[PDB]
């Protein structure tokens, strides 16, 4: 989606437009989708562990999906940031222009979401040790 | 009309005569006329050709065709002294020597790989480091098991030596003499290797040093990564076709077959394909345009290597003209008085748009492969726990 | 060849390319040419031969014969040939001490194991006397001799490094 | 000049000096066996042998990574001998195995003594093979 | 088959990053792989901090300010110009001295025009 | 008294090991700044060869 | 190679043997020069340098 330089309000998609970094962020796309899958697997396997506690292993395995998710954010966010910095580098260096990339509140929400499912990862494993010693 | 030979001057609308034009061959026509003593009329050619004899009608075009057929008296221009032209007109000695050269894109910061963090030490060092690590760990195990003082089995020896190399200290240390000779010499090894990693990395980050992959046409012939191509026609095209040396026959069997077609159709198409292929296209062209486009804007192109052949630009007169001998001695005056060198430095370099710090923070790209090994080692540690939980 | 890189010689390009291909392979040609000149075939200014020779040179130039003959005599009949990371040759001696220190420690593991398996005041009285006499000896000699500081202040010559000392000396704490 | 392959030969003089010390101790153990004893030379031998494999098993993965295909090939006849004594004939055992519970009945006692001089003859020839190609790769 | 609950694990990893780590050390193979790749991570990161800071402080020490006209004639990254008329512009135009002919060669061909029109305009541009 | 000798030997090696790395980084940087002669303008500037 | 002695105004060398009839042609590394081209006829350069 564009603004203020040829201000076209048409939110273009990534496949029906053609910048080389816009193909570089395609490479860092599956990892926030693998992360969101493992959070949804770990969540529906945590709720089974709340309604049927007769088998306790539901809580520990859902803790593993909460931790494999956050490790897939970090590889995704390293891939995402490193794809930007590689294409900011491969440009004709001219001191009569300027460049400026920033991050927005969607990058921040993917960053905070690391902290919450790694915290849900620890608390699901401590919940397993409460159930198993009881 | 060719740059920097004849360029129409900026406000040529309000000008008339020999002063509508500027350039190298305008400054040269001035020097030829004050040494030979005549008055001249600068006259841009009709067709726009340099001169060639037609294969069917046998009629010369261009500037050669105006000298043969009478329409001109001298051709002070970048006109190449060749065999077929010398038979119909008369050249002087070359006022400029030139040949076929290579145009590549000017090298850049060269984005990092995954294992770019390994690069302060050579790969032959890193292989010696890994095998000396198992080496001191086996010798710790031999020394501690036989002739005991242990707590130093093979996996506590691999962990002592790993923690010693990473400079993380230890939990246990050897208590015998012979275990302390192993431990203390591996400590001194680590001290030199980690200090020379940081010192050689500080040298790289202080001094930028960009090297070009191609520095000769031999280096182009020994690779297929960078695609090289001439223009679709002309003399650079004809050179590689009929060449027989050793290397230009190799460079010709490459270009004639390669898909997509490496032969551009215009010089500006070949320069743009250099600038817009990020170091994968090397354009083969005359060394005078190559040195001029290097001095235009942007600073995106570069001349590498020496020339491939030797040719020259001559000042031509009709065969039998009375200017033929004095213009020839005029060029040799201008050569030895340094005038021709001075005119080339003015129009190539003193009027050159490209002429002739602040260390930046490390980007995540430079060190990103350490994060990949870390999470690759975090996921490998979760498998080994899963195998440990099943096997026990 | 005798100034270690502190001298550069300005000559013609074709001798600089020829001496580069003749043993010893000490020298190299750097940069582009400073001027532009050419070698010609000359004729007596009224000859009936200067015109066929001129078309012969332009024919031999465009058939690659002149480039063929230069490669033959400069390069094919030549005598010579034709990373930024830290190499093993710079840190080779810390690998020698490592291998030398691992071999020392396996030797000590022998003469510990033989000593462990097979198995006072008089010894230390004997050793703390002969180390104290020779301590008094070696420092007693050293402060009373004049061989502390060998000092030269000579001058070099740019002729095969001809060396002439003028202030060679040996010193002590009390003598010069 | 010093290189990674020259270091792979330096690092295997040091460990073949251990491999000959395993075998001098292995010929003394069966000579002192015949003089006297089973349960101790069960235990004293059994601890020795697994270092002797993996040190030689280190040499296989060290000259593989050094691209020394003649040197890797000359360690192949001792390697595939070693795989047989641990994967198919470490007779039943199950403490470590092989110079274990199976002593006298005296037919393996002759087989071990023929092996014990065959180990020393290979290791003393490996020591001078490694010392030669050390000096070879350093000088060249 | 603890000492490595979540708060001792945060203290092992904090002390491993600072390269200050005495405490419990991991004893299992799987705890020593995570310990070992985090030790290699900080060996690269702490060395990169010191090496990039040494690169900064060296380049900031190499900086030579302008103190001559030969420093202006070499460094073609600071622009320099005169007033549009008068003795100072005619000095470089007529000069046959090497460093001053190089400065006029730069000034007569420079885009945009380095020649100011008033002394107050030239002090403004500085 | 054992911690004074331990403490001044800790400060000794903090200076000595830092001096080794800093002087080796000074060497490798200066050896990387070295530009060989490749022009006559490199000869006209460098008045040491 | 050939040079004019400014006293005698005579040529010594290969340019001398061409101007005074001894030679018919000089295939040699003879530099095309202003002062020589006035008295002998050079071809096009067979070698540029
Ligand atoms: C061993 C000891 C270790 C402890 C060290 C602690 C240090 C910090 C630890 C973790 C922090 C990492 C996570 C940071 C989140 C990503 C933020 C980011 O990199 O992208 C920035 C975004 C977008 O910036 P913008 O365009 O909206 O503003 C521009 C303002 N203009 C237009 C006026 C210029 O941030 C935004 O503002 C989006 C709107 C607000 C949402 C983000 C708020 C996050 C704050 C706290 C939560 C994080 C954990 C606790 C700290
Ligand atoms: C000992 C236990 C603790 C250590 C744990 C290790 C696990 C993590 C290690 C590696 C995984 C992370 C990275 C994967 C490597 C392949 C990706 C790759 O792109 O590699 C490229 C490399 C060459 O890199 P370059 O610097 O020349 O790039 C040049 C780029 N330019 C052209 C811009 C200059 O070439 C190659 O493929 C080299 C061959 C790849 C070998 C790595 C094996 C990866 C397989 C599985 C990973 C483990 C999963 C855990 C469960
Ligand atoms: C996740 C582990 C790292 C993965 C290894 C990355 C290797 C590949 C990286 C980039 C691709 C470029 C490879 C091309 C360079 C040489 C070709 C080669 O054959 O590619 C492997 C080399 C072996 O080295 P070479 O130069 O002697 O081969 C010379 C071979 N010729 C004669 C053909 C040149 O590169 C090497 O693998 C040397 C690098 C070994 C890295 C291990 C050390 C890292 C950790 C150290 C701390 C722990 C140990 C101490 C405690
Ligand atoms: C990069 C390419 C090189 C990697 C080579 C991998 C191939 C594997 C072959 C050899 C690797 C190691 C080199 C040679 C080792 C000889 C020593 C040995 O083999 O020792 C025999 C062990 C004894 O056991 P112990 O500790 O209880 O005796 C002590 C009793 N106490 C605990 C009461 C104190 O017997 C055992 O089964 C030992 C159990 C495991 C044997 C293999 C060692 C693990 C792998 C190490 C290499 C990887 C480095 C990290 C990357
Ligand atoms: C570039 C090359 C250099 C850089 C590399 C640096 C590291 C150098 C390599 C090795 C140095 C080893 C560090 C020195 C400390 C080791 C000494 C040690 O602690 O070994 C322990 C053994 C066993 O201890 P224990 O409790 O059984 O003894 C008392 C018995 N009880 C308690 C029953 C009465 O002790 C013994 O063997 C005592 C006999 C030791 C004899 C040899 C030591 C030398 C002695 C004086 C010279 C000073 C050396 C200065 C260097
Ligand atoms: C805590 C300690 C850290 C643990 C980190 C461990 C990672 C590093 C461990 C081992 C290094 C692996 C790679 C070593 C390569 C040997 C290189 C060498 O020095 O010899 C040179 C030969 C010849 O090179 P070329 O002409 O074939 O390549 C031409 C390349 N081109 C395709 C561009 C034309 O290279 C060869 O292939 C030699 C033949 C095969 C060698 C590679 C096979 C690796 C086998 C076992 C090692 C374990 C690997 C686990 C990962
Ligand atoms: C600025 C950005 C960087 C920081 C971002 C935060 C991300 C953190 C991600 C993962 C860590 C999870 C947080 C830890 C709390 C969960 C565990 C819990 O709650 O129960 C367990 C603990 C008992 O631990 P332990 O006995 O095994 O310690 C080891 C001692 N050994 C071995 C002797 C037995 O119980 C307790 O300490 C009572 C709990 C203490 C109350 C304050 C701690 C926070 C608790 C909940 C908020 C979660 C933060 C989310 C953001
Ligand atoms: C650029 C790339 C990154 C560079 C740096 C990365 C470094 C990552 C490597 C870390 C490991 C290095 C140090 C190795 C020692 C760890 C293993 C260990 O600590 O001991 C392993 C096991 C279990 O310990 P334990 O029960 O004996 O200890 C008794 C104490 N308690 C009861 C508390 C458990 O010992 C046993 O059972 C032995 C039985 C059979 C052993 C199987 C042989 C295979 C072993 C391979 C070793 C390496 C694995 C691959 C990585
Ligand atoms: C290399 C990748 C593909 C997988 C390697 C993991 C497996 C194959 C290896 C790693 C080294 C081996 C270990 C052997 C010793 C210990 C001790 C044992 O009490 C349980 C398991 C445990 C902790 C390991 C189990 C896993 C093991 C058999
Ligand atoms: C413990 C023993 C058996 C293993 C190998 C011994 C090694 C460490 C010793 C043996 C004697 C030493 C040599 C000393 C002389 C030369 C000259 C030197 O310019 C480089 C190394 C070189 C070629 C040798 C390298 C190996 C050396 C440093
Ligand atoms: C290169 C060689 C000579 C140096 C090795 C030192 C060896 C030979 C000597 C030094 C004197 C001996 C030490 C004498 C004191 C103790 C006490 C004893 O209870 C056992 C051994 C022990 C710990 C030492 C072992 C090493 C020893 C056997
Ligand atoms: C078990 C898990 C945690 C370890 C391995 C899985 C995933 C998360 C990670 C770790 C390191 C990653 C690689 C890193 C390098 C390259 C290059 C990059 O341009 C894209 C991805 C790619 C091709 C890899 C993708 C997969 C990746 C392997
Ligand atoms: N920059 C950087 C960097 C940061 C951390 C670790 C290593 C590097 C690095 C180092 C080197 C290098 C090389 C020789 C000598 C010393 N250092 C090179 N590179 C690098 C940079 C760009 C592309 C490829 C490698 C690097 O990325
Ligand atoms: O006599 C000739 N003199 C030439 C002089 C030049 C220039 F360098 F511009 F002076 C050029 N160009 C080089 C690159 O393409 C655009 C123009 C072509 C010339 N050609 C045609 P070619 O040599 O057959 O290609 C002649 O024939
Ligand atoms: O005799 C002269 N004396 C001058 C004295 C000065 C001053 F410095 F103010 F004293 C100046 N200025 C230079 C700086 O900005 C303000 C005017 C100009 C002078 N000029 C003209 P210029 O030298 O051609 O430029 C003369 O002719
Ligand atoms: Na530095």
Q: Which of F21, F26, F33, F41 to mutate to test the interface with B (most CBs of B within 10 A)?
A: F21
Q: Cα–chain-centroid distance for residue C100?
A: 28
With contacts defined as CB-CB under 8 Å, which chain C residues touch F38?
Answer: 30-31
Contact B381 E55 (CB under 8 A): no
SS3 of E121, please? helix
By three-state DSSP, how is residue B180 classified?
A: helix
| CA dihedral of residues C73, C77, C79, C82 (deg, nearest 10) | 80
Say how far apart CA E12 and CA B169 lie, in whole Å.
13
List residues near ligand 9 (CB under 6 A).
Answer: B 383-384, 387-388, 391-392; E 29
Separation between Cα atoms, residue D54 and residue B116, nearest integer Å: 33
CA–CA dist D37, D35 (Å, integer) = 9
Q: Annotated binding residue at B31?
A: no
3-state secondary structure G14-35: HHHHHHCCCCCCEEEEEECCHH
SS3 content of chain G, % helix, strand, coil (to 5): 20, 35, 45
The CA distance from B246 to G33, in Å, is: 34
Report strand pairing: G3-5 vs G10-12. Answer: antiparallel
Report the 10 Å Cβ neighbour count for B268: 10
Q: Are A79 and A27 in contact (CB under 8 A)?
A: yes
Question: Would you state the structure tokens that stand for residue E32, as one six-digit string?
Answer: 């020593």
Is there a contact between B278 and B84 (Cβ–Cβ < 8 Å)?
no
Structure tokens at B140: 């710790």
Q: Which two tokens stand for residue B326?
A: 């004095």
Question: Ligand 7: which of A74, A126, A129 to mutate, judged by most atoms within 8 Å of the beta carbon?
Answer: A126
Task: Write down the residue that tokens 């202003």 correspond to.
Answer: G34
CA distance B194 to chain F (A): 9
Q: What are phi and psi of B89, to 5 degrees?
A: -130, 180
> Phi/psi at B244 (nearest 5 deg)?
-140, 25
* Distance of alpha carbon B196 from alpha carbon B126, whole angstroms: 13
Write down the H helix ranges in chain D: 4-35, 38-46, 49-65, 69-74, 76-87, 108-139
Query: How many A from CA of B132 to the centre of ligand 3?
Result: 14
Q: Which residues pair with B282 in a beta bridge?
A: B228
Chain centroid, CA E50 distance in Å: 15
For residues E64 and E60, give the distance between their C-alpha atoms in angstroms, rounded to a whole number. Answer: 9
Using CA atoms, how far apart are residues D25 and C50, in angstroms rounded to an integer? 95
Rounded Cα distance, B108 and B275, in Å: 12
Tokens of B44: 């841009």
CA dihedral for B247, B248, B251, B257, sign (positive or negative): negative
B255 CB neighbour count, 10 Å cutoff: 18
Structure tokens at C99: 């291998």
Q: Does B224 belong to an annotated binding site? A: no
Q: Sign of torsion, CA C129 C132 C136 C139?
A: positive
Is the shortest distance between the CB of A112 and ligand 1 below 6 Å?
A: yes
Query: Which of E77, E98, E80, E100 has its CA nearest to residue E90?
Result: E100
Q: Is E44 exposed, middle or buried, given 0-12, 13-18 or 19+ CB atoms closer than 10 A? A: buried
Q: What are phi and psi of B100, to 5 degrees?
A: -80, 130
Q: How many CB atoms lie within 10 A of CB B67?
A: 25
A133 exposure class (CB count in 10 Å sphere: 0-12, 13-18, 19+): exposed
Distance CA B139, CA A59 (A): 45
Q: Is F29 within 8 Å of B198 when comparing Cβ atoms?
A: no
Q: How far apart are CA B85 and CA B93, in angstroms?
A: 14
Taking alpha carbons only, the member of B89, B20, B101 closest to residue B50 is B89
Domain range spanning residue D3? Answer: 1-140
> How far is B17 from C151, CA to CA, in rounded Å?
80
Cα(B288) to ligand 14 centroid in Å equals 10
C97 CA → ligand 10 middle, Å:
9
In chain D, the number of structural domains is: 1
Residues B168, E19 contacting (CB under 8 angstroms): yes
Report the alpha-carbon angle F25-F26-F28, nearest 5: 65
Say yes or no: F44 contacts chain B, CB-CB below 8 A: no
Q: Touch between chain F and chain B (3+ CB pairs, < 8 Å)?
A: yes
CB B75 within 8 A of CB B270: no
Report which secondary-structure segment, H or E, holds B8: strand B7-8
- Which CATH number covers residue B66? 3.40.190.10
- Helices and strands per DSSP (H, E), number in chain G: 2, 5
**Secondary structure of residue G4 in the 3-state scheme:** strand
CA of A108 to the centre of ligand 1 (A): 6
Q: Are B85 and B61 in contact (CB under 8 A)?
A: no
Q: For residue G28, count other CB atoms closer than 10 A to its CB.
A: 13
Angstrom distance (rounded) from CA B287 to CA B310: 10
Q: First CA to last CA across chain B, in angstroms?
A: 86
Q: Are strands B311-318 and B89-91 parallel, antiparallel or unpaired?
A: antiparallel
Residues of chain E with Cβ-Cβ distance to F29 below 8 Å are 58
Give yes or no for B300 touching A (CB within 8 A): yes
Contacts with B, E 68-97, CB within 8 Å: 76
Work out how many CB contacts closer than 8 A connect A with B: 40
Nearest chain D Cα distance for residue B286, angstroms: 45
Residue numbers in the known binding site of G for L-glutamate are: 29, 31, 36
Question: What is the number of CB-based contacts under 8 A between chain C and chain G?
Answer: 99
3-class SS shares of chain B: helix, strand, coil, % to 5: 45, 15, 40
For residue B78 the two structure tokens come to: 């970048």
Any bridge partners for residue C156, and if so which?
Answer: C163
**Which structural domain, as residue segments, surrounds residue B39?**
1-105
End-to-end CA distance of chain C: give it in Å, rounded.
40
Chain C residues near any Cβ of chain D (below 8 Å):
88-89, 92, 95, 99, 102-103, 106, 110
Q: Tokens 């001439």 label which residue?
A: B230
B121 to C85: CB separation less than 8 angstroms, yes or no:
yes
Measured from CB, residues less than 6 Å from any atom of ligand 3 are: B 115, 118, 123-124, 126-127, 129-130, 133, 162, 165, 373; D 4; E 40
SS3 of A12-55: CCCCCCCCHHHHHCCCCCHHHHHHHHHHHHHHHHHHHHHHCCCC
Closest alpha carbon within chain F to C34: F40
Helix (H, G, I), strand (E, B), or coil: what is residue B90? strand
Dist CA A1 CA A102 (whole Å): 15
What is the token pair recorded at A5?
Answer: 């330089």
Largest CA distance in chain C: 115
DSSP per residue over B33-87, as a string? HHHHT--------SS-----B-TTT--B-HHHHHHHTTS-S-EEEEEE--HHHHT
Nearest of B145, B305, C115 to residue D55 by alpha carbon:
B145
φ and ψ of G12, to 5 deg: -115, 125
Q: Contact A45/A66 with Cβ under 8 angstroms?
A: no
Chains A and D touch, using 3 or more CB pairs below 8 Å: no
G47, C39 contact by CB (below 8 A): yes
Question: Which tokens sit at B274?
Answer: 């250099």
B152 CA: nearest ligand 4 atom: 34
- Find, among E120, E122, E47, E52, the residue nearest to E89 by Cα: E122
Closest C-alpha among D73, E76, C85 to residue B352: E76
Of the candidates F29, C37, A33, B149, the one whose C-alpha atom is nearest the C-alpha of residue E56 is F29
**Residue C43 · residue C50 · CB < 8 Å:** yes
Beta bridge partners of G5: G10
**How far is ligand 3, taken at its centre, from the CA of residue A86, in Å?**
24
DSSP assignment, residue B170?
-
What contacts D40, CB < 8 A, 6 or more positions away? Answer: none
Gapped junctions in chain F, after residues (C–N > 2.5 Å): none
Question: How big is the CA angle at D20 (ends D18 and D21), to the nearest 5 degrees?
Answer: 60
Task: Tell me whether B93 touches chain C (CB under 8 Å).
Answer: yes
**CA–CA dist B320, D136 (Å, integer):** 75
How far, in Å, CA of C111 to CA of A56, rounded? 59
Q: Answer whether B83 sits within 8 Å of C95, measured CB to CB.
A: no
In ligand 9, the atom with minimum distance to the C-alpha of E30 is 23
Q: Are B6 and B23 in contact (CB under 8 A)?
A: yes
The whole-angstrom separation of Cα F19 and Cα D72 is 43
Per-residue tokens: B392: 């026990």
Q: Closest Cα to residue B141, out of A21, C174, E22, C109?
A: C109
**Euclidean distance between CA atoms B137 and B267, whole angstroms:** 64
**Tally of CB atoms within 10 A around E108:** 14
Report the distance separating Cα B302 and Cα B283, nearest Å: 10
Residues facing residue B264 across a β-bridge: B231
Cα–Cα distance measured from residue G47 to residue G49, given in angstroms and rounded to the nearest whole number: 7
Q: B370 to chain E, minimum CA–CA distance in Å? A: 6
Residue among B166, B206, B362 minimizing CB distance to E59? B206
Q: To what resolution in angstroms was this structure determined?
A: 2.8
Per-window interface: B 141-160 vs C, CB < 8 A: 142-143, 146-147
Cα–Cα dist E77/E73, whole Å:
10
- How far apart are alpha carbons E44 and E47 in whole angstroms? 5
**How far is the centre of ligand 7, averaged over its atoms, from the C-alpha of A119 (Å)?**
8
CA count, 13 A, side-chain hemisphere, B284? 30
Contact B156, C118 (CB under 8 A): no
Contact C166, C155 (CB under 8 A): yes
Upper half-sphere CA count for residue A65 (Cβ side, 13 Å): 17
- Cis amide linkage into residue B4, ω under 30° from 0: yes
Distance of CA C136 to the CA centre of its chain: 45
Please list, in sequence order, all residues whose beta carbon lies within 8 angstroms of the beta carbon of residue D41, skipping any fewer than 6 positions away. D29, D30, D32, D33, D99, D103
Judge whether B183 is closer than 8 Å to chain C, CB to CB: no
Between helices B177-206 and E29-59, what is the axis angle to 10°? 40
DSSP string, chain C: --STTS------HHHHHHHTTSSS------S--SS--EEEEEE-SS-SSHHHHHHHHHHHHHTTHHHHHHIIIIIIT-SS----SBPTTTSHHHHHHHHHHHHHHHHHHHHHHHHHHH--HHHHHHHHHHHHHHHHHHHHHHHTSS-SEEE---EE-SSTT-EE-SS-EEE-SS--
Residue numbers followed by a gap, chain E, C–N over 2.5 Å: 1
How many angstroms is it from B137 CA to the middle of ligand 8? Answer: 13
Q: Which atom of ligand 11 is nearest to the CA of C112?
A: 28
Contact B137, C103 (CB under 8 A): no
3-state secondary structure E66-117: CCCHHHHHHCCCCCCCCECCCHHHHHHHHCCCHHHHHHHHHHHCCCCCCCEC
Q: How far is B202 from chain C (nearest CA, A)?
A: 12
Task: Report how far residue C125's alpha carbon sits from residue C118's, in angstroms, rounded to the nearest whole number.
Answer: 26
Q: How far is CA D40 from CA B283, C117, D94, in A?
A: 80, 17, 16
DSSP, res E25: -
Ion ligand 16, residues whose Cβ is below 5 A away: B 202, 206; E 54, 58; F 25, 29
Measure A85 CA to nearest chain B CA, in Å: 6
* Residue F40 three-state SS: helix
Q: In whole angstroms, give the CA distance from residue B179 to residue C109.
A: 9
For atom 11 of ligand 12, the residue with the nearest CA is: B372
Place of tokens 């009375």: B322
Residue written as token pair 């405490």: E23
Q: In chain F, which residue's Cα lies nearest the Cα of E51?
A: F25
Range list of H helices, B146-171: 154-165
Q: Evaluate: CB of C82 within 6 angstroms of ligand 13.
A: no
Q: For residue A78, which of A35, A14, A42 has the smallest C-alpha distance? A: A35
CA distance B277 to C4: 43
User: What sign has the CA pseudo-torsion B68, B70, B71, B77?
Assistant: positive
Q: Are E83 and E115 in contact (CB under 8 A)?
A: yes
Ligand 3 atom closest to residue B122's alpha carbon, by position in its atom list: 26
């Amino acid at each position: 989606c564009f603004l203020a330089g040829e201000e076209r309000g048409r939110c273009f998609t990534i496949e029906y437009v053609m910048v080389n970094v816009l193909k570089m962020i395609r490479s860092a796309t599956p990892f926030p989708l693998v992360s969101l899958f493992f959070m949804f697997i770990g969540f529906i396997l945590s709720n089974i562990g709340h309604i049927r506690p007769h088998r306790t292993i539901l809580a520990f395995v859902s803790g593993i999906f909460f931790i494999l998710s956050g490790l897939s954010l970090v590889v995704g966010l390293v891939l995402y940031i490193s794809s930007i910095n590689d294409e900011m580098l491969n440009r004709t260096k001219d001191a009569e222009t300027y460049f400026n990339y920033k991050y927005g509140w969607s990058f921040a929400f993917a960053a905070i979401s690391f902290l919450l499912t790694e915290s849900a990862g620890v608390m699901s494993v401590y919940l397993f040790m409460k159930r198993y010693t009881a | 009309l060719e740059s920097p030979y004849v360029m129409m001057k900026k406000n040529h609308e309000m000008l008339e005569g020999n002063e509508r034009y500027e350039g190298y061959c305008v400054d040269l026509a001035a020097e030829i006329a004050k040494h030979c003593g005549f008055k001249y009329k600068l006259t841009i050619v009709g067709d726009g050709k340099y001169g060639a004899r037609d294969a069917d009608t046998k009629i010369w075009n261009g500037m050669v065709g105006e000298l043969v057929y009478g329409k001109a008296d001298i051709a002070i221009a970048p006109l190449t002294i060749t065999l077929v032209r010398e038979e119909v007109i008369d050249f002087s000695k070359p006022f400029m020597s030139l040949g076929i050269s290579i145009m590549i894109k000017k090298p850049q910061k060269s984005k990092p790989g995954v294992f770019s963090f390994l690069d302060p030490l050579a790969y032959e060092i890193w292989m010696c480091i890994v095998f000396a690590y198992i080496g001191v760990s086996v010798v710790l195990f031999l020394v501690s098991r036989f002739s005991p003082y242990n707590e130093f089995g093979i996996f506590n020896s691999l962990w002592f030596s790993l923690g010693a190399f990473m400079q993380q200290g230890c939990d246990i240390s050897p208590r015998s003499l012979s275990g302390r000779i192993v431990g203390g010499v591996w400590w001194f090894f680590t001290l030199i290797i980690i200090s020379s990693y940081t010192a050689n990395l500080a040298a790289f980050l202080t001094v930028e040093r960009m090297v070009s992959p191609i520095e000769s046409a031999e280096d182009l012939s020994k690779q297929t990564e960078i695609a090289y191509g001439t223009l679709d026609s002309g003399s650079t095209k004809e050179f590689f076709r009929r060449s027989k040396i050793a290397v230009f026959d190799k460079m010709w069997t490459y270009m004639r077959s390669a898909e997509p077609s490496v032969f551009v159709r215009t010089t500006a198409e070949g320069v743009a394909r250099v600038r817009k292929s990020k170091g994968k296209y090397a354009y083969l062209l005359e060394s005078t345009m190559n040195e001029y486009i290097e001095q235009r804007k942007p600073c995106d192109t570069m001349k590498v290597g020496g020339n491939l052949d030797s040719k020259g630009y001559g000042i031509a007169t009709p065969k039998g003209s009375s200017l033929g001998t004095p213009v020839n001695l005029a060029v040799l005056k201008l050569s030895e008085q340094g005038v021709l060198d001075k005119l080339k430095n003015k129009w190539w370099y003193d009027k050159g748009e490209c002429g002739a710090e602040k260390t930046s923070a490390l980007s995540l790209s430079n060190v990103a492969g350490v994060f990949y090994i870390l999470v690759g080692g975090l996921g490998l540690a979760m498998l080994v726990a899963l195998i440990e939980f099943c096997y026990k | 060849r005798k100034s270690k890189g502190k001298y550069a010689y300005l000559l013609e390009s074709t001798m600089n390319e020829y001496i580069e291909q003749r043993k010893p392979c000490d020298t190299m040609k750097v940069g582009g040419n400073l001027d532009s000149k050419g070698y010609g075939i000359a004729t007596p200014k009224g000859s009936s031969l200067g015109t066929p020779v001129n078309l012969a040179v332009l024919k031999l130039s465009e058939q690659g014969v002149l480039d063929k003959l230069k490669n033959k005599w400069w390069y094919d009949k030549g005598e010579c040939g034709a990373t930024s990371a830290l190499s093993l040759s710079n840190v080779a001696g810390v690998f020698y001490i490592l291998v030398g220190g691992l071999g020392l420690a396996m030797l000590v593991a022998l003469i510990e194991f033989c000593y462990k398996s097979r198995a006072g005041r008089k010894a230390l009285t004997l050793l703390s006397s002969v180390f104290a006499v020779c301590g008094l000896g070696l420092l007693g000699i050293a402060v009373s001799t004049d061989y502390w500081l060998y000092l030269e202040e000579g001058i070099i010559l740019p002729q095969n490094q001809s060396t002439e000392v003028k202030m060679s000396l040996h010193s002590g704490l009390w003598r010069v | 000049a010093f290189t990674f392959a020259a270091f792979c030969y330096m690092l295997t003089l040091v460990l073949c000096a251990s491999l000959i010390f395993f075998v001098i101790w292995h010929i003394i153990a069966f000579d002192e066996l015949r003089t006297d004893n089973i349960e101790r030379i069960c235990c004293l031998l059994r601890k020795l042998v697994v270092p002797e494999y993996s040190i030689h098993g280190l040499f296989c993965l060290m000259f593989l990574c050094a691209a020394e295909w003649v040197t890797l090939g000359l360690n192949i006849p001792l390697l595939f001998y070693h795989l047989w004594r641990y994967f198919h004939r470490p007779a039943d055992g199950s403490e470590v195995m092989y110079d274990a519970v199976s002593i006298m009945n005296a037919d393996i006692l002759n087989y071990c003594q023929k092996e014990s001089w065959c180990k020393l003859a290979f290791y003393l020839l490996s020591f001078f093979y490694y010392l030669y190609s050390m000096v070879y790769t350093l000088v060249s």
